[PDB]
Design a protein around this nucleic acid. Sequence first.
DNA 1: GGCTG
DNA 2: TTTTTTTTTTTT
Lengths: 432, 432, 432, 432, 95
Amino acid sequence: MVEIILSHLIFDQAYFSKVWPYMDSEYFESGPAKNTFKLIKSHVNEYHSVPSINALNVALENSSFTETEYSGVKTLISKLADSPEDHSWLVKETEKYVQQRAMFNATSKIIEIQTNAELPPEKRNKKMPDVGAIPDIMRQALSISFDSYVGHDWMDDYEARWLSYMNKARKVPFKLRILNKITKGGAETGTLNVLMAGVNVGKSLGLCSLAADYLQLGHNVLYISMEMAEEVCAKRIDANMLDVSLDDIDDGHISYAEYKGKMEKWREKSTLGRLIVKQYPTGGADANTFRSLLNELKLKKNFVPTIIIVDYLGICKSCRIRVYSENSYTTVKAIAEELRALAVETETVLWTAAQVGKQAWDSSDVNMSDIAESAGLPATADFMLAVIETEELAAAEQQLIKQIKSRYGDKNKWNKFLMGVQKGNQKWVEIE
Amino acid sequence: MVEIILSHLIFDQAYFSKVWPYMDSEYFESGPAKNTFKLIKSHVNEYHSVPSINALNVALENSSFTETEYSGVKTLISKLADSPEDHSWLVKETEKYVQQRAMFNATSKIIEIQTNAELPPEKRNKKMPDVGAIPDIMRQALSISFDSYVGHDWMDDYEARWLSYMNKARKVPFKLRILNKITKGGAETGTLNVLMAGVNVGKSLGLCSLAADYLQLGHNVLYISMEMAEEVCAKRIDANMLDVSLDDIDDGHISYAEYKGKMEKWREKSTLGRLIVKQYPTGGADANTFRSLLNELKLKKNFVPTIIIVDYLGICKSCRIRVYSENSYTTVKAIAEELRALAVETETVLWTAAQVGKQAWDSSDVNMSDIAESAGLPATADFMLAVIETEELAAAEQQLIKQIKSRYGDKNKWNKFLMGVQKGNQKWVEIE
Amino acid sequence: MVEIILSHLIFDQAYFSKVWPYMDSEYFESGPAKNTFKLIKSHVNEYHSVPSINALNVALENSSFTETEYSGVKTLISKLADSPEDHSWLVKETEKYVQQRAMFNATSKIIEIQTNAELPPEKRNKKMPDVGAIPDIMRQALSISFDSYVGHDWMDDYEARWLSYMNKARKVPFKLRILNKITKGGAETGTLNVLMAGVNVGKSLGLCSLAADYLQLGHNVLYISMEMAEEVCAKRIDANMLDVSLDDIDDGHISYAEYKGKMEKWREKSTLGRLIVKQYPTGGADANTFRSLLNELKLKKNFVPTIIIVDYLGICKSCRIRVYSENSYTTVKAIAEELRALAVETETVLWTAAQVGKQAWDSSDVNMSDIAESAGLPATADFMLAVIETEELAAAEQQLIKQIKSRYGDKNKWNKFLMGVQKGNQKWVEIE
Amino acid sequence: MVEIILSHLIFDQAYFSKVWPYMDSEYFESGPAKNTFKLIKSHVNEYHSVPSINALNVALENSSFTETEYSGVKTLISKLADSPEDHSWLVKETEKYVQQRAMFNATSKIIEIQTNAELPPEKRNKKMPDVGAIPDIMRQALSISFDSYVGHDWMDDYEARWLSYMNKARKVPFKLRILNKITKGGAETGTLNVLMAGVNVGKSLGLCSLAADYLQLGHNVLYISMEMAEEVCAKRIDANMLDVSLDDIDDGHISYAEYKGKMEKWREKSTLGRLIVKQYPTGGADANTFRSLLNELKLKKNFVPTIIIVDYLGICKSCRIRVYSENSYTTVKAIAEELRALAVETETVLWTAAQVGKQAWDSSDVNMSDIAESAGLPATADFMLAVIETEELAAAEQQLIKQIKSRYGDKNKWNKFLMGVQKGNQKWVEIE
Amino acid sequence: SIPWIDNEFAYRALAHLPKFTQVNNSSTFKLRFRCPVCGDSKTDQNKARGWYYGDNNEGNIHCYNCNYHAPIGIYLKEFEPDLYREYIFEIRKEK
DNA sequence: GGCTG
DNA sequence: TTTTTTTTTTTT
Ligand SMILES: Nc1ncnc2c1ncn2[C@@H]1O[C@H](COP(=O)(O)OP(=O)(O)OP(O)(O)=S)[C@@H](O)[C@H]1O
Ligand SMILES: Nc1ncnc2c1ncn2[C@@H]1O[C@H](COP(=O)(O)OP(=O)(O)OP(O)(O)=S)[C@@H](O)[C@H]1O
Ligand SMILES: Nc1ncnc2c1ncn2[C@@H]1O[C@H](COP(=O)(O)OP(=O)(O)OP(O)(O)=S)[C@@H](O)[C@H]1O
Ligand SMILES: [Mg+2]
Ligand SMILES: [Mg+2]
Ligand SMILES: [Mg+2]
């Protein structure tokens, strides 16, 4: 019903006020319709008013159109008329038409993406999204509607604000009380949490400490390690939970009898979850691979995680961008968005560990202008912490957390606090 | 376009009074259009009024034209309608048509001058202007504009300027008597105004107080927050407007009945504006994202603001600088310039806040030299109010407001004044 | 490649044990391929074993098909052979085929959903899902990778993990007691180890000392020089092994008799290994050249090196990135990743040097931030030691070695230790 | 015999091991002979194994070339079949075929370069090499003989190594005793030695003194000046050799009789080489230019230098990086590496000058970190000497030479000694 | 460039291509042929959308089906190397 | 029955 | 959009 839409854009005002901000040139066929809409949009952009028939016939004459295009536009303009109908069926019909056009465009785009992917390298188009980006596009098209929320309107959105006042989101508590204090009860389900740190300063130590703490609380924890072997991460967890140093395990100070006894003592406890460590090669795993892993874990082991942990965000595959196509910032932002989408879909608290820039290394204080790969990670993330064990905290067997971005509470309340990192047992103890 | 021009010369008054002095016979054609315009001009010269269709036909009957000219003029006269187009588009389009025709005539004239110049000197026309007159002729073609407004012309716009001083066309009052006293009637449109907070003063309390005061005066306020969510800023706004303490909302002392009653009482009042709160991540909002936000609000929400309040200048990002530092002077200077450019181009009062220098923190008196942003903020800021909160003032629930830069009026007239800050309701009350 | 898939399903148990878990009739075709796979699936369901050609033909006789389908199935069944192709290529190709067929089916399904949505509610089928099911449908078709391994469990696999604790075959001792002490048993196979210092401090001295120490332990050492000639580095190795001097070799203080005697005495030792020195022009080699060099070395001589020393990573040339395609942070990190991949493929200890920026060329200490090339090298590295020499140290002939990145052990247990570097002999001497 | 080569690449493991490392895509027919080999090479790079006929067919079906190319590749693959053969006839025939194809490609590229250089500029299709590297390409066409040198074995090849210590043909002695003492016999051929002084401290006086000293010791010296005329450098050499001050030549205190007598007295001495001075405009000479100069010197003037001197490397042009494309660091490092490559190619002692940073000027000490244009120059230079002059040293007619990078010996020993530079005679004298 | 040797060499290279026609007017040299890259139109076996234009400074081949556009030298280098050898030699012979 | 840049 | 060299400048 393109002709009706154009006719009521020209000859009606309430319809124009209701539907114009959502109309786009891509919703019209490449014939007379798109060119007529181009003329209307140019007139509105230049004069901030709805053009008349004379205005468009003047705009058509002052246009660089071929004979076929000129004839089609003139015929379409001649065919326009103000058919009296109701301003409740027109709006819904226009919304339906726009949604259908958006779905059609998305389908064509994903077909083109799949055709592009199968092409051999050095011939395939670049900057075109890969196959893994197909669902996201299909998520955007379904979101088209003639209702748009731009900002929070005082006196117009106050019931929702009162609900936000009275209601509080559910929280997965930590085992460290300081994190609960700075997060008002823990972390929410569909979140992307990042623990940035320098190189060789405790990115995996903190993640393994969190994994052990969550495992002792009865959660199903999935540790996806992209840099370390499964046995290494499981040895970190064992050191955390069996109270044996990594030096003792490697040197063989502990015997197999003591190890088995401690493992069985932990097994007999009812307040224990299941921790599963999966190793992927560097750059060999993405969000879709994680979803396949979750599906096989559910099907073959009856395992549904809650505390999915990714060792390093910067190593994982983009899943939306082809490898070595965009810059580090865009690729890491895409990875963060994909991981947060996975966390929201699976209702799992997702924890990761990015790397800070070379400037932040051995720096007593860090800020958001220290992230190495991408500064867009805080925007995508829901809670971001830092590690500041630079020069003298190591001698005192301590650490420091900056709280760069905390969406659960206020970052400027307990911004910097001291953590008792114990590297032999790979754990965090509190200074209290 | 000529048909529209003639029709709206015949059947309009404002268009005639606006475009008649810039209308010439040579601008139309060498056929029916020129003859019709000659008839119109002859009628308006003999009778100083716009001719009617019957009078035009009588003049055509009593005129010296051949058969083809008679047919063309009759058809064109029969093809003129009193249709109603918008005035701005009509004036702009007829101006463009006149300019194009004048340029074509001048180019043809200079080509004819050049052709006559390359002719035997014994054999040439004397009336044709010499070649040296070519640059001037084109100038007369370029000096064709229905309305000349290039800047403010002294001695030529003194009557309009006086209407600005009497009507205070630029001032926006403050709702606080002291702030109106030192600004000679409030802040001005197209300005950047900042608050300097010493140690122990919040930057968002004063901004929320100003936003509430502007809201109570009927102004559209756009509050862009960086370090806080939309709900938190709107909660500060509610605290100030509903007289409820900030902690009372979190505790639950105020019930839904009182909240809704107060909100509907405010909604009943016709002297209330609209407040739109938009949240952006730290460092993820330059003064080009604000332009997009304004465009979206105007197109979708029809919300065109008169007050724009940015939560914190330091948290913002310099679009020109591109790179982002937590506390760098070059970025603050660029951010201030970009925000003031936005205020000027949008004709809105723009408010922001900054932290004073550490020396300014310790000293109750704050010097422009004692500012974290030196030569960057006291250079791009029309007004820079300084807020001092010492122990004695806090014990008395007061803050010392000092005027550090006042483009509006004399800085030393009323430099120091005590403000009744309420930290619970986030409000500024005057002191007798 | 349906014929290959079916042939290796029937005639290969290893292929059947990794692909049958993930296989459906929708993946193959709508003609003879689907019918053949349906026969195979029916036979394996009725009898839990892979069918044979005779059994498949008997089942085809028992099953009922139309004439065309019967002929197609007979023709396809006739075309099955063992054809022992590679297992890795076969599984990768069948994974690709399954993924592409699943994507095609998902696209057709969403197109059918969209077509059914446009139908009137009376005409539309209730079995097809709504448009809201379009995204997840496209997502479940992107999570069909072939991977049955779920990973460690920490409670169901602690016996295997303890057995893995006893697998110390990855460790390679250092011949220096301090290095073994700080590495908890020496370096590990398939790791990128770096020895960084300033210009003219002894990086190649340390590399040659490590080469000699590994040679005296019976290892095969491959020294790849990027600046010096083969005979020059071999002179340093001779100075380390024969233990006379560098100048005495060039000053004639060594009589041929002594040189021959010492070389033959070292030949008589059964604890000595093999050392091959290879030189490359600056910026002309990487793992691609190194892999061909490894293959040529293995073919020409019974030499599979356990230790691979690269004179400098920076002088090396990246495989994919051109000579000056991108900046240092990229291509240097790319070369580091390629070298680590080569080391983990060959299961060899990889040693290389790194340069330090000018800021730490005359400093008593050097940090990880003082890496002249990309900071991604101290991300792919595993044991990045650092060599610091001052005037006081050079007076005592004692270079200081600082533990910069220690992945094997605790980086701060023995952070700084003094060595006994003898520059004339190109040897590192432990200090007790 | 491309079919045989491909067939034995497929059906012969022994053949593939030797021929593959050398096979390249530019050695077969551009059509299937090349398309089939590209398929095989892609399969080998993806799976590290020789593809089978089924694998080749599968890759052919998943390929994007047209119908003609597809049919040609299919026919070629169908024609591939193993035949009873012998390893030797195949390896020798393959070597002959590869050499012939390399020669054919080389001569085609030579013709293309000749027909491209004979074109008007700005239309010469840049990125094509100039005529100067016409023979070098042919030299690459002859260095393909299936006989890659694996490397040098420490124990297997030590008689050849020992017959390189008393040879001493690599070292070229100085004339000053201190320089010989610190370098333990003088500089070595195929090296890059550098003087760092600053601006107007020396650094060309030292180069001229070295040139004169080498010339007196029966050497052919090639001075290359990028910033001075051929007569200024020759005047400096005349002042050095004839023991006549530059002021005396300027002021005419030396007669033609004395000049002629001194020149003839030098000529009649047998212990004297030939010095040739060549001038190039600043930034208008590179390694290829120097090689062309060497060739034309050998042919036209039968002059074979051994002590090639370049006045300043920083003033030369890189032969690989486009001008002003990369920063100073990369460009200067590349220039120094190319100069060292030239020196090792022609087996000459290469001497050069380098500037220091602005901070090192008028300083009593110059460190290695004070190098001006690149930190890579010290890393890619065999020997560097820093020339330091203060007011006290200038008043004493002495300069302090500090050993900054001493690759021929220990720099800690004799790090700073005082030369007796005489600026009038452009000569260095010792103080011993 | 040398136009007449391009016309002579192009003809032989495009002579092998089917549907080969010599569109030679009094002032131009064009060759019509089936495109060897794509096989021209799959539906219409009698269409010859491959063209050679030798009246310009450089004789260029252009396909109107698969949008291939190349000089005659690149065409000879990529598809007829035996003809490409003599082509560049006769080019060198007269240059 | 031709058509490019 | 980050990254790294070198320089020059300026601000604190
Ligand atoms: N086997 C070990 N025994 C004792 N301490 C260890 C051992 N391995 C590592 N550590 C310590 O643990 C610290 C943190 O190491 P990681 O957990 O790997 O941090 P990291 O950020 O993951 O390092 P990356 O991934 O290489 S950037 C190191 O700095 C060491 O001090
Ligand atoms: N014609 C001359 N007569 C006398 N002394 C001279 C003459 N030319 C140069 N000198 C001296 O030689 C010193 C060093 O000369 P140079 O070798 O040209 O210095 P330089 O470092 O090569 O110059 P740049 O900046 O590198 S081009 C100067 O400082 C003068 O004292
Ligand atoms: N021929 C020699 N005789 C004695 N000492 C030497 C000799 N060559 C080098 N040295 C010493 O070796 C030290 C550093 O050796 P190098 O291996 O050259 O250091 P490096 O520059 O980091 O390694 P490179 O650049 O890859 S050769 C110097 O400071 C000298 O003291
Ligand atoms: Mg880690
Ligand atoms: Mg070095
Ligand atoms: Mg000089």
